[PDB]
Design an enzyme around this catalytic site. Structure first.
Site, PDB file in Angstrom:
ATOM      1  N   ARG A 146     -39.847   4.695 -21.521  1.00  0.00           N
ATOM      2  CA  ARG A 146     -39.761   5.214 -22.878  1.00  0.00           C
ATOM      3  C   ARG A 146     -38.912   4.290 -23.731  1.00  0.00           C
ATOM      4  O   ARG A 146     -39.402   3.564 -24.599  1.00  0.00           O
ATOM      5  CB  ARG A 146     -39.120   6.607 -22.884  1.00  0.00           C
ATOM      6  CG  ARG A 146     -40.050   7.766 -22.613  1.00  0.00           C
ATOM      7  CD  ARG A 146     -39.842   8.351 -21.229  1.00  0.00           C
ATOM      8  NE  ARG A 146     -40.511   7.583 -20.189  1.00  0.00           N
ATOM      9  CZ  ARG A 146     -41.188   8.127 -19.182  1.00  0.00           C
ATOM     10  NH1 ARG A 146     -41.282   9.443 -19.071  1.00  0.00           N
ATOM     11  NH2 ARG A 146     -41.809   7.355 -18.306  1.00  0.00           N
ATOM     12  N   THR A 147     -37.619   4.350 -23.455  1.00  0.00           N
ATOM     13  CA  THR A 147     -36.613   3.575 -24.139  1.00  0.00           C
ATOM     14  C   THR A 147     -37.031   2.146 -24.411  1.00  0.00           C
ATOM     15  O   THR A 147     -37.194   1.773 -25.566  1.00  0.00           O
ATOM     16  CB  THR A 147     -35.333   3.567 -23.324  1.00  0.00           C
ATOM     17  OG1 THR A 147     -34.943   4.929 -23.033  1.00  0.00           O
ATOM     18  CG2 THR A 147     -34.251   2.845 -24.079  1.00  0.00           C
ATOM     19  N   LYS A 200     -28.617 -15.953  -8.715  1.00  0.00           N
ATOM     20  CA  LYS A 200     -27.537 -16.932  -8.568  1.00  0.00           C
ATOM     21  C   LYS A 200     -26.119 -16.362  -8.679  1.00  0.00           C
ATOM     22  O   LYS A 200     -25.160 -17.122  -8.822  1.00  0.00           O
ATOM     23  CB  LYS A 200     -27.697 -18.064  -9.588  1.00  0.00           C
ATOM     24  CG  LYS A 200     -29.025 -18.812  -9.535  1.00  0.00           C
ATOM     25  CD  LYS A 200     -29.115 -19.763 -10.734  1.00  0.00           C
ATOM     26  CE  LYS A 200     -30.427 -20.528 -10.763  1.00  0.00           C
ATOM     27  NZ  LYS A 200     -30.547 -21.468 -11.913  1.00  0.00           N
ATOM     28  N   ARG A 205     -29.497  -1.902 -21.323  1.00  0.00           N
ATOM     29  CA  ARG A 205     -29.453  -0.696 -20.520  1.00  0.00           C
ATOM     30  C   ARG A 205     -28.833  -1.259 -19.255  1.00  0.00           C
ATOM     31  O   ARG A 205     -29.238  -2.315 -18.787  1.00  0.00           O
ATOM     32  CB  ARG A 205     -30.856  -0.130 -20.250  1.00  0.00           C
ATOM     33  CG  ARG A 205     -30.896   0.957 -19.163  1.00  0.00           C
ATOM     34  CD  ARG A 205     -32.258   1.663 -19.082  1.00  0.00           C
ATOM     35  NE  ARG A 205     -32.430   2.744 -20.061  1.00  0.00           N
ATOM     36  CZ  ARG A 205     -33.277   3.764 -19.905  1.00  0.00           C
ATOM     37  NH1 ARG A 205     -34.030   3.826 -18.811  1.00  0.00           N
ATOM     38  NH2 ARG A 205     -33.344   4.744 -20.814  1.00  0.00           N
ATOM     39  N   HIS A 218     -25.978   7.483 -24.211  1.00  0.00           N
ATOM     40  CA  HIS A 218     -27.312   6.951 -24.497  1.00  0.00           C
ATOM     41  C   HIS A 218     -27.512   7.307 -25.959  1.00  0.00           C
ATOM     42  O   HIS A 218     -28.239   8.236 -26.279  1.00  0.00           O
ATOM     43  CB  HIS A 218     -28.401   7.646 -23.679  1.00  0.00           C
ATOM     44  CG  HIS A 218     -29.755   6.998 -23.787  1.00  0.00           C
ATOM     45  ND1 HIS A 218     -30.186   6.346 -24.925  1.00  0.00           N
ATOM     46  CD2 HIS A 218     -30.791   6.943 -22.915  1.00  0.00           C
ATOM     47  CE1 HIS A 218     -31.427   5.922 -24.749  1.00  0.00           C
ATOM     48  NE2 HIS A 218     -31.819   6.272 -23.536  1.00  0.00           N
TER      49      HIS A 218
END
Ligand SMILES: [Zn+2]
Ligand SMILES: [Zn+2]
Lengths: 153, 310, 153, 310, 310
Positions: free
Chosen positions: E54-55, E84, E105, E134
């Protein structure tokens, strides 16, 4: 001249009777299309020689007229079996199944890879009559199987 | 509004000869006179739940060349349909509220069909249906075949790879059977034979088809030798015997072939065609791959643009 | 030697005759003992008139004298219920089963970790006169489970 | 032939007060006047489909002190039941023709019973019926309770910890319940309380039993504090909340305990009993574990010996 | 320069009522007199170290509706913070010399806050601060609530999923609590309860709030039913007991409820809502998703455009 067979049955004043049902198909129809949630008189005659001299199955039902669509859905299990509509011991219109144009919500794509095996989807198959067989085709998986390999409930 | 505006493209079995000819006709035009800003303010979703290179990049380059924006995922592993265990239906219900069309590839048959029942009036372009349909791959094929052969009817088309799990031959065969006088030659292992519903479709239409245990035979008179790779990933353990290509094409094999003949191939190959065939004039799988941009540029323009592109 | 004035199953060869009672059990009682395969007649009729004390259904047994071992496989779905299996002609040779402790090859131990699940065993429990209820105990797992928890066949 | 000659030892529930006493009896003198050749020409099977240190070593050791041989497996992983997917019924069916007795521990309930239906004429000692019975461990408890209390009747026995899956408590409650005037204190998390069938068996006999939410409640009147470990391996997902030991015994917690008291615990422990308690006179879990040799030696002797050892 | 220009969007707790209304205000206009060329020469970076559908998709989609390019990564695995072993700070400090804005996120809590200490002068949009705030999600929720309810004050909101790790309620609750007279109904299992700091806030702000053991307890009074998903991926082993949705919403459970009610749900779901609710008029959790395009498209405009997008 109405009712006169020298055999034992249990007519249902105002009801539905489905005769000429192949052995091991009567139970199958009452154990498939769920003809039991009915606190109404249903009579289950299994493996009886009432119609003709073969081993048939009879499903007497009180006022449970299955539309021309729920009867056709039987053509895949007992294409010969006729279905009689009765009006108070005084019978009316007869009939005998017709291969559905589709058989949605009852069968299952035998396809292990088919998508309808993991998502909330009502199974569906276009019904196609062929030579010595009927071909069922998912609307989803799109493959096609023989009605003898498509299991259902 | 053209026949294909807003329509979904889930199966070659759901389009007509006209629908097909309209794509090709469009594809031609755009190939001649491009339209950089055609789908200017359109935003398309590229949803791939299974590996892909050309199909996704050919498709994605097609959007940029029509000025469209691209959003999506190439790996369902970093989606909520992977880490947070959620249904596809839902995944499609939400996406359909962000984009103007959904290009999806799934490892399970009928997954694109399913999305249509949830993408609200938002076109769903079936990239590749698990081993089932692949409408966009067939367009390259037609556009390519007609290109090389100059026509779509009266063709001797041979199909060599895995025909049972070959979503590319399933579509292309139903499409070529939408044109007159086409003759097919199906070559493949008994286990992965051409699926029956297809054969039955040919007989209804009374199209000519035969089986052969070797390329070498039909080689003489085939216009299109359409080979395929063995869908190892869709195979069943009880079929792992066919895991290796049972038919291989070598340059020498093309000694007695017609001139207008070409070798095609949705392309991920693995030894079915020796690398020594690329030098040959009959080689056309790579070029066939390039038309990818055209075919798909045409499909996108006909589904997202009410008017016929010139 | 029956005495009936209103709608009830007929006489057969060595006919039974008593107040049976499925509370919409009859059908499952067929798909629990496999009473649909025997291609011989089938005395089936769900939803029938009761003696004004909870509706009931009848099903005698023709051409079969159900062993006095399977008939007890009924008393766990009605401690005070009915009779069956009678002699050759239309007279009564009834029986009324109690609460038999042995239940073999019919029920499964609900215990997620009861060998009776992965091995070729034949389940067996112990019926008890428990507090207001009835509980059974797997012969291998020895865990007690109410007969309501063992409804899963 | 003694009451236990050639008999299966699957459940304490299938034994009489006489049986137990007899074992204990035997254990008495076997611990006094050893018989290093008592089972000289016997070869016993040690089948452990589950992990175990005490129960298998004390068990097998026992067997040698009686001059008997041992054959078996401590990990079903390298057996045929393991790598070739063979059934247990078959396993026991073959093994019953090689040894003279079968000693099995399994993660599943009823394993021992099942085995008795396939090993014909071959005694099957249940060493661990997954979360169910554990006959042999109960014998060690009794031989130990009696060794430290002088009697097995008129005792205040507390059983703390996981009592739902604690196979050890199932057998010891049923055991001690075959003696007169015993009192029980079941201290445990609600989610792992003493099974009902054990509670009902106790009422059926009229045995006194109560519940408690702590140790200092009954510490002053209990003769045997039977500690137990929480059966993680067997817990159900919805019970992982009880994974950590809810009750803890510290050397300080015994400040007001009877003198004739002992702390029991079959041994895998994990902070249910702080290490500082070993230093106390009440600690008796290791000394009880040692009696495993005697109790198990006696059971062996009893089952393979028609004659009644002296 | 409007109130949020070049400002970071890390925590609802860090924004004022005016700010929120400002977004909602802008969101509105942007669907009246849209501006497909607002952020024409801007390049934004979408850095998702965590799974999302969604986000991330709505978020990038909005970026395109505003004419900005997109560069990023959907899986930290193919970055050098992955293969790495490079710090998240060094990752930021460089990306901040490429793009005009960072959208991130992250699995851990405060990773967004942290990255602001390094991306000099480059706005950090927190798309999912590991089980903490959020921000963006909330802006939908409000825009959605006020769309169906007409107001953002005087409302009977109920939040029913795991509220302890439900980073979606942490924000919506602190937000709504900036509006007058909002009543809350926290439904959830004891282990996964609404964090103290949110309850303590509500008190010192004098907001009415109560707990409940079922949905149908408050069903008749709520205007908004905020179902939420179990955060299985963030739970601790000692909670694998709450993995299953303990509260389920079904079509039946739904009609002794107000008319104006709507069922809102941050979007990923697993049986907390039977699929049969979709059909009802109260279902709004999909249209709530689509509103993602506007809320975010709004927040992007404000942070990267000096002049209040008039
Ligand atoms: Zn299917
Ligand atoms: Zn059991």
């Amino acid at each position: 001249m109405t009712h006169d067979n020298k055999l034992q049955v249990e007519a249902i004043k105002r009801g539905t009777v489905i005769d000429h049902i192949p052995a091991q198909i009567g139970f199958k129809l009452l154990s498939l299309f769920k003809l039991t949630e009915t606190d109404q008189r249903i009579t289950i005659g299994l493996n009886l020689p009432s119609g003709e001299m073969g081993r048939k199955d009879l499903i007497k039902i009180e006022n449970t007229f299955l539309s021309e669509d729920q009867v056709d859905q039987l053509a895949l299990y007992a294409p010969q079996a006729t279905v009689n509509r009765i009006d108070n011991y005084e019978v009316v219109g007869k009939s005998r199944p017709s291969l559905p144009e589709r058989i949605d919500n009852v069968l299952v794509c035998p396809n292990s890879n088919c998508i309808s095996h993991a998502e909330p989807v009502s199974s569906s198959f276009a019904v196609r009559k062929r030579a010595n067989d009927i071909a069922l085709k998912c609307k989803y998986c799109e493959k096609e199987f023989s009605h003898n390999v498509v299991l259902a409930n | 509004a053209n026949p294909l505006y807003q329509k979904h493209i889930i199966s070659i079995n759901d389009l007509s000869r006209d629908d097909l000819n309209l794509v090709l006709a469009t594809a031609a035009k755009l190939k001649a006179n491009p339209q950089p800003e055609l789908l200017k303010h359109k935003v398309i979703a590229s949803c791939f739940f299974e590996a892909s290179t050309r199909t996704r990049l050919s498709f994605e380059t097609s959007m940029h060349r029509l000025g469209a924006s691209v959003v999506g995922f190439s790996d369902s592993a970093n989606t909520s349909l992977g880490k947070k265990g959620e249904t596809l239906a839902d995944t499609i219900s939400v996406i359909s509220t962000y984009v103007d069309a959904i290009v999806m590839r799934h490892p399970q048959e009928g997954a694109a069909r399913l999305a249509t029942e949830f993408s609200g009036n938002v076109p769903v372009l079936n990239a590749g249906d698990g081993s089932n349909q692949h409408p966009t791959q067939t367009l390259l094929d037609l556009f390519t075949i007609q290109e090389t052969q100059g026509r779509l009817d009266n063709l001797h088309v041979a199909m060599v790879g895995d025909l049972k799990y070959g979503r590319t031959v399933h579509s292309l065969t139903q499409a070529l059977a939408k044109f007159d006088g086409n003759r097919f030659y199906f070559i493949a292992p008994d286990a992965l034979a051409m699926p029956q519903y297809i054969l039955d479709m040919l007989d209804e239409k009374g199209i000519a088809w035969s089986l052969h245990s070797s390329i070498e035979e039909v080689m003489a008179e085939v216009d299109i030798l359409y080979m395929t790779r063995v869908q190892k990933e869709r195979l069943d353990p009880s079929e792992y015997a066919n895991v290796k290509a049972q038919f291989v094409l070598r340059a020498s094999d093309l000694h007695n072939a017609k001139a207008n003949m070409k070798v095609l191939h949705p392309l991920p190959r693995v030894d079915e065609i020796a690398t020594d065939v690329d030098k040959t004039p009959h080689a056309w799988y790579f070029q066939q791959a390039g038309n990818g941009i055209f075919a798909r540029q045409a499909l996108l323009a006909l589904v997202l643009n009410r008017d016929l592109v010139l």
